[PDB]
Write a protein that binds this ligand. Structure first.
Ligand code: ERY
Ligand code: CA
Length: 299
């Protein structure tokens, strides 16, 4: 730990980031990297990723391309800007604010920084602005993007394929499968546009100020150009229909792509949540996710 602190200091030093030793904090980490918070010698807070795996550049290429787009175009919110980006260290200045909530992974619950029983309307207004700006970034103007890019029909066929693959692996309850298929087959419910999405929008990744304005988004690994609807699912799951409606309203009124069955579509996408849990179970090998998936698939 003194060894680990000493190592952090040394790695940062080699990238000309000079840290106050007493401020170094090691955070909950997965297998890709160790997450660290530290303050530099000018009093500025930083976020570091210490790599735990080889091939950092290929594995971070998509996330970095997404961040490059957001930093190039977006002004209504902050995103990580990897001023230090090498195989040995990724580091960026910490975004302002705090997460709206963080997941306690043992009860399976958010620890909220807002009042869940009286959600500030500015959360929805600000997130609506943020998402409308994000989703209208002209990703097509990049010369060489490696993000997944879907047309509207490609986004629908992607879901169709993902569902078939989960069914083949785990099975799916009959009623749930029929619901998914009815959704896939309802032409008019599907969006007729796609856009650049964050892909992991939830309270842990939405940085808020003291008034619950969303001022920043972190953790862009799931970014891609596809159905914008994924970025609305958190509002529904956390806040119910009221929170979903408030976000849709804010988004629509500031100019975001809106279609008549948008709410209905997002609710059907929410019903397809088990697809994501099943995929995560398969790729992570974490038994608890396999169990959660099988329960959610109604098998
Ligand atoms: C309401 C309260 C619940 O929160 C959600 O429903 C939100 C809104 C999910 O996002 C929703 C919405 C959405 C879009 O992600 C933001 C979607 O992809 C996922 C599947 O479900 C989250 C965050 C999911 O995480 C995401 O799961 C992905 C499989 C990978 C992703 N990430 C590491 C790449 C990761 O953040 C996931 C699975 O529910 C986390 C596990 C821990 C839970 O089961 C916990 C206990 C949740 O049930 C919850 C706290 O109770
Ligand atoms: Ca209330």
């Amino acid at each position: 730990m003194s060894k680990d602190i000493k190592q952090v200091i040394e790695i940062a030093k080699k990238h000309n980031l000079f840290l106050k030793e007493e401020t170094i904090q090691f955070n909950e980490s997965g297998l890709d990297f160790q997450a660290v918070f530290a303050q530099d010698n000018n009093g500025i807070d930083w976020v570091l990723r210490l790599p735990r795996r080889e091939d950092v550049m290929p594995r971070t290429k998509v996330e970095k391309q997404a961040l490059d787009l957001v930093n190039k175009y977006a002004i209504s919110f902050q995103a990580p800007n990897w001023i230090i980006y090498t195989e040995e260290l990724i580091a960026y200045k910490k975004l302002d604010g705090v997460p709206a909530g963080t997941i306690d992974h043992n009860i399976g619950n958010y620890i909220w920084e807002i009042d869940i029983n009286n959600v500030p309307e500015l959360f929805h207004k600000s997130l609506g602005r943020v998402l409308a700006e994000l989703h209208s970034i002209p990703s097509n103007k990049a010369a060489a993007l490696d993000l997944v890019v879907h047309t509207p029909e490609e986004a629908r066929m992607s879901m169709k394929q993902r569902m078939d693959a989960v069914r083949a692996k785990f099975g799916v309850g009959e009623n749930l499968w029929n619901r998914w298929q009815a959704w896939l087959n309802d032409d008019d419910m599907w969006p007729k546009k796609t856009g650049l999405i964050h892909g992991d929008v939830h309270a842990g990744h939405t940085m808020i100020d003291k008034d619950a304005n969303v001022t920043g988004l972190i953790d862009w690994t799931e970014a891609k150009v596809t159905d914008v609807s994924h970025d609305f699912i958190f509002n529904y799951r956390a806040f119910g229909e009221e929170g979903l409606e408030a976000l849709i309203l804010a988004y629509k009124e500031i100019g975001g792509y809106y279609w008549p069955k948008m709410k209905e579509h997002i609710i059907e996408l929410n019903a397809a949540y088990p697809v994501s849990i099943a995929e995560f179970a398969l790729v992570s090998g974490i038994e608890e996710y396999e169990q959660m998936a099988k329960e959610a698939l109604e098998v």
